[PDB]
Amino acid sequence: KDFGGFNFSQILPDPSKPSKRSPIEDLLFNKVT
Amino acid sequence: NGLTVLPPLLTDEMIAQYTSALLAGTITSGWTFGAGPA
Amino acid sequence: GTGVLTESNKKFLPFQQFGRDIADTTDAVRDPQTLEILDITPCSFGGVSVITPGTNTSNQVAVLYQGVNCTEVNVFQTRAGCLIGAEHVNNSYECDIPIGAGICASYQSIIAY
Amino acid sequence: TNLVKNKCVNFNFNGLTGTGVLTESNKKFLPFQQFGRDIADTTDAVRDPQTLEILDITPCSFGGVS
Amino acid sequence: DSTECSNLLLQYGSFCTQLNRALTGIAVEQDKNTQEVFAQVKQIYKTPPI
Amino acid sequence: SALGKLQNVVNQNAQALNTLVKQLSSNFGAISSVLNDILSRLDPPEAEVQIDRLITGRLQSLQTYVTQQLIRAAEIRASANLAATKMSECVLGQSKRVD
Amino acid sequence: SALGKLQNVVNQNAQALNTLVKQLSSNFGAISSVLNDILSRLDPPEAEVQIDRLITGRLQSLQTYVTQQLIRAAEIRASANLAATKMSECVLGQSKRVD
Amino acid sequence: QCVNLRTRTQLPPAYTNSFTRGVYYPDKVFRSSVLHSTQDLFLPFFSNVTWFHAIHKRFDNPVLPFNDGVYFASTEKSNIIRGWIFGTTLDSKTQSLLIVNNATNVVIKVCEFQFCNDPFLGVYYGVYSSANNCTFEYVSQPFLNFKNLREFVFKNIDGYFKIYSKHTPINLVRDLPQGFSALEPLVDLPIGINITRFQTLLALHRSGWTAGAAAYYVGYLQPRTFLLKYNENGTITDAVDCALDPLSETKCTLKSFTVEKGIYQTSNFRVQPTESIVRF
Ligand SMILES: *[C@@H]1O[C@H](CO)[C@@H](O[C@@H]2O[C@H](CO)[C@@H](O)[C@H](O)[C@H]2NC(C)=O)[C@H](O)[C@H]1NC(C)=O
Ligand SMILES: *[C@@H]1O[C@H](CO)[C@@H](O[C@@H]2O[C@H](CO)[C@@H](O)[C@H](O)[C@H]2NC(C)=O)[C@H](O)[C@H]1NC(C)=O
Ligand SMILES: *[C@@H]1O[C@H](CO)[C@@H](O)[C@H](O)[C@H]1NC(C)=O
Ligand SMILES: *[C@@H]1O[C@H](CO)[C@@H](O)[C@H](O)[C@H]1NC(C)=O
Ligand SMILES: *[C@@H]1O[C@H](CO)[C@@H](O)[C@H](O)[C@H]1NC(C)=O
Ligand SMILES: *[C@@H]1O[C@H](CO)[C@@H](O)[C@H](O)[C@H]1NC(C)=O
Ligand SMILES: *[C@@H]1O[C@H](CO)[C@@H](O)[C@H](O)[C@H]1NC(C)=O
């Protein structure tokens, strides 16, 4: 992830999560009930 | 007869004030006020 | 029927007893004993609305009677209706709870502005 | 008659009739209560009058055939 | 104002609540429409006197 | 006829309200359109039938009015979304979009 | 209240389904809201009338639900068309359109 | 046998606050973690309930109108209150209901009794004189510093007499404690009779006579709406009176105990007619 200092970890999919969602997407799915 | 008319939240004076603000912004500042500081 | 009777400025022809509006409701009537014309305004109908902040914040409420004059119900007369329980202030803030006709309510007691 | 569980049967419990699958329930009723309702006011839990046990009433498996 | 009519009307359920809810939604939607169209600036700009 | 678009909205709303109140004067097959006349002229066993006819007619009229208001509200919402887009793109900036 | 727009859609759909369920508990002028009670308490000549009242009430409820679902579907379709436009013009390119 | 009690001390009746008491289960239906809005004869929250004392010389056994229902609260020790008198005229002309709890069991009878003017029992350390035509008898298991709190709700609906009750262990000296306790349904009686008046039955202590220390409260049931909260275990833990204040009216309208910030249209306002005018 060498993008010249630009960080996209909060929007790219998280490999640690089984749902393969981004942290922002995971938060969005948790916040809607 | 059960019929009521609710007034609008923004009166005609405040809508006129909003249009005046938009006119003043587009006259004195161009399109700069719509994208950030005027 | 049921309605408020007021003195009327309308001039009925001598064969006429009552009067209808656009919606065919009786808005004027002639008294059969004393020949005078009376408007029949309907009794006041309002929508009762409760203005409150979150129950986590406070339990204070204000009551809005929509389209209702304050003489027929911290009492403030707005164009939207009569607002009871909100202190009217002369200061202007951003709209927090919309009341209508330029009036908004907030919690700081409940104020209306 | 005898009680049959885990099948879509027509149940008539104390004048309350319907069709459903009667399974064992983990809901512990208070002793004065007889029927059980969900949010939508449908009978989903019931008490057998002969033996004081709680039964869940699952609706029969209706579906759309496409 | 007929109480017998309202007693008979309660047998039909929540039709009246649905209609009031729809009209309330339209009423708040109109204010949202005006807010979206005209309130596009949070600063009240003024022209110069000259 | 310059401002016909606003006048049509005002006229449609007033006409819909006027028709909704006019529907109260219809008996919908009952003996009378007035509840007071039915309450004063009949016993409750037949009065329930007469008010039932008036209730179903008036409820149908109100449902029709609310449905028309919802459709008109959707049209006005589309027009308002277009107007907000024009306010953003024509007033607050210069638009390259043709027409 | 950040995600209120999605929550409103979820709440409206759930509330419409709940209202459609709760309309079954209304008798609509019949002696009971349960068809079994009417069929067990009355002979078929009068049970036909009571069942007819329940049928017309439930049919009106279902038509009301379908009509409001169609109106909400039109609103959601407009929002989805806007979202597809934003996907094409903001994500797949750089937009000169103001706001 | 009847005995006139002529040693009473004159005192006006007391009044106190109901707080959030008098709630009972409207039906026999279990509900779990849900909010239910119901229209029934309920006791209003924070209402003015009549307070009667039994202390030594006070012996409060009057006859009161039943109205549409009776909430009976009892701050009781040593079991002075034993039963109730239900009827319309309280004589042999009509048919009356008797509820008694003596030393062994509870007896419920619907008969034509000749009530005394001052009915009571007595314990050493006379409530009727005749019984002519009986139609219903029911013998049951016994229901029972102030140590016990007894809540009862009596209702006459469609010829059914509903008795709701709750036992509460309290340690408060004088007034009603502040809290929430929903009353379970205890017994439904198929009586089918008219009842418009009631009277409490006390017990004397003899060693003249002495009145044991007891206090009771009478509240009246009114047709209203409650929003009841049912927890996971299915007990009513909290309630909202929809006609008490606009905040609880909003809670009743939105079907929630928590209300977010905003304006919520809850009811409608109608001016009520003051007079009726005829012009002929
Ligand atoms: C990109 O951003 C993420 C999160 O904003 C960075 O991950 C953090 O790394 C530091 C030190 O490496 C840790 O102390 C934090 O706990 C991490 N946060 C999370 C949420 O994991 C990451 O280092 C940044 N850079 C790259 C190249 O990925
Ligand atoms: C206890 O007092 C009451 C009230 O005075 C007595 O009831 C009255 O009895 C007399 C008997 O001749 C009647 O004439 C009155 O009509 C009764 N009053 C009412 C209101 O009915 C009662 O008799 C007394 N008890 C005893 C045992 O003497
Ligand atoms: C209860 O009623 C009595 C008189 O009936 C009155 O004096 C008292 O103030 C009332 N209490 C309340 C709390 O209203
Ligand atoms: C209680 O009353 C019942 C019926 O009235 C009677 O059979 C029983 O003997 C009584 N017991 C005592 C202790 O008085
Ligand atoms: C009620 O009792 C009286 C006196 O005991 C008697 O004369 C009368 O016949 C009785 N009525 C009935 C219906 O039993
Ligand atoms: C019940 O009793 C009261 C008072 O005695 C009376 O006014 C009422 O009409 C009675 N009701 C019936 C149904 O007899
Ligand atoms: C519900 O019951 C369980 C045991 O049955 C208990 O652990 C839990 O605390 C109860 N919940 C409440 C709110 O009392």
Author numbering:
A (entry chain B): 795 to 827
B (entry chain C): 856 to 893
C (entry chain B): 548 to 620, 641 to 675, 691 to 695
D (entry chain A): 531 to 596
E (entry chain C): 745 to 794
F (entry chain C), G (entry chain B): 943 to 1041
H (entry chain B): 14 to 69, 77 to 145, 158 to 176, 185 to 247, 257 to 329
Tell me, in the authors' exact words, what the paper reports.
Within the receptor-binding domain (RBD) of the S protein, both the Kappa and Delta variants share an identical substitutional mutation (L452R) with the previously emerged variants of interest B.1.427/429 (Epsilon). Finally, the P681R mutation (present in all B.1.617 lineages) immediately precedes the furin cleavage consensus sequence (682-RRSR/SVA-688), with initial reports suggesting that the P681R mutation enhances cleavage, and consequently S protein post-fusion transition.
The Delta variant contains a novel T478K mutation within the RBD - that is not present in previous variants of concern - with uncharacterised effect. The cryo-EM 3D reconstruction of the Delta spike reveals no large-scale structural changes, with the predominant conformation having one RBD in the up position, as found in the wild-type (D614G) construct. The Delta spike contains NTD mutations within the footprint of 4–8 but not 4A8 and similarly evaded both antibodies, suggesting both direct and indirect mechanisms of evasion. Figure 5d shows that the wild-type/Alpha/Delta variants and the Beta/Gamma variants may be binned into electronegative and electropositive surfaces at position 484, respectively, which would result in charge–charge repulsion if these variant S proteins were to dimerise in the same manner as the Kappa variant.
